[PDB]
Amino acid sequence: TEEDVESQLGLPILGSIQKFSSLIVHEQPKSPISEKFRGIRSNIMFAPDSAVQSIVITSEAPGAGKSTIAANLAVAYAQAGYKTLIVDGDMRKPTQHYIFNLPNNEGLSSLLLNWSTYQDSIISTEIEDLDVLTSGPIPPNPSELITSRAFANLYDTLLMNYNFVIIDTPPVNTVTDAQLFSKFTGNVVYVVNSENNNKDEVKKGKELIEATGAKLLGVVLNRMPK
């Protein structure tokens, strides 16, 4: 199935994740699934002259499990020794505060608008070397925030303070938020729901990501069978 997707979509497979509290890499660190997350990490970082310090994670459509992939990949980076930040850049339908069991009264949107401080907006989790910047309150104008000087300045600060930054984003099919964040990271990981029978959507997502000019590092195939 992996080889089918690699050829039909024309992208390398960074890893395939079987169907499977969300944080399997933390709760079951020796599991074969957790090892596949470590394989994704390794495939991103060892692919010579790439210096990847940050990535956008997006998907072809809603319901692909993208946010769970992003969170577990962040745990894998932290376990490998990277001081890691996961940013919930989906300010429309945020989920990282649910995944990590955190409040969402302060986060990305409030930080950018000066309603909360840097120090208050980023939370250190109970997992060593893993911090989370939740989305904050839902703004009426998310794309304006992403393209603001405020975000450009924040991004520079994050690169000073973290060895690796992962930005979860909305799916790429209807809004351009993922593309706008890709200006900053220069790098995108594409989560594809293997259960999605609409291959036009899968192919279109690749096209949309490539149109940014960012490096499409490869695909994470999710919800694979045993």
Numbering used by the authors: 201 to 220, 1009 to 1035, 1037 to 1215
Question: How do the authors describe this structure?
Answer:
A new family of protein tyrosine-kinases harboring a P-loop type nucleotide binding-domain with a Walker A motif has been described. They have been called BY-kinases (Bacterial-tyrosine-kinases) as they are only found in bacterial genomes. BY-kinase autophosphorylation on a C-terminal tyrosine cluster, called Y-cluster is crucial in regulating polysaccharide export. In firmicutes, the situation is quite similar except that BY-kinases are split into two proteins: one corresponds to the cytoplasmic catalytic domain of proteobacterial BY-kinases (about 230 residues) and the other is a transmembrane domain homologous to the Wzz-like domain (about 230 residues) of proteobacterial BY-kinases.
In order to find out the structural basis of this discrepancy, we solved the crystal structure of the chimera CapA2B2 (last 27 C-terminal amino acids of CapA2 fused to the N-terminus of CapB2). Previous mass spectrometry analysis demonstrated indeed that each band corresponds to a different phosphorylation level, from 0 to 4 phosphorylated residues among the 4 tyrosines 221, 222, 224 and 225 of the Y-cluster. This result demonstrated that the Y-cluster of the CapA2B2 chimera from S. aureus autophosphorylated spontaneously during its production process in E. coli cells. Autophosphorylation was however less efficient than for CapA1B2 since addition of ATP was required to observe the fully phosphorylated form of CapA2B2. As previously observed in the CapA1B2/ADP-Mg complex, the phosphorylated C-terminal Y-cluster of CapB2 is disordered and analysis of the crystal contacts using PISA confirmed that the protein is a monomer. The CapA2 N-terminal part of the protein adopts the same αA-βA conformation than that of the CapA1 fragment. Interestingly, CapB2 residues 1 to 8 linking βA to helix α1 are disordered. Unlike the CapA1B2(K55M) structure that contained bound ADP-Mg while no nucleotide was added to the crystallization solution, the active site of CapA2B2 did not reveal any electron density corresponding to a nucleotide that would have co-purified from E. coli. This is in agreement with a previous study showing that CapA2B2 displays a weaker affinity for nucleotides compared to CapA1B2, with respective Kd values for Mant-ATP of 190 nM and 50 nM. In the apo structure of CapA2B2, Phe220 is slightly shifted compared to the CapA1 Phe221 residue stacked against the bound adenine in the CapA1B2/ADP-Mg complex. The reduced activation efficiency of CapA2 could be explained by the absence of the CapA1 last residue Asn222 that interacts with the N-terminus of CapB2.
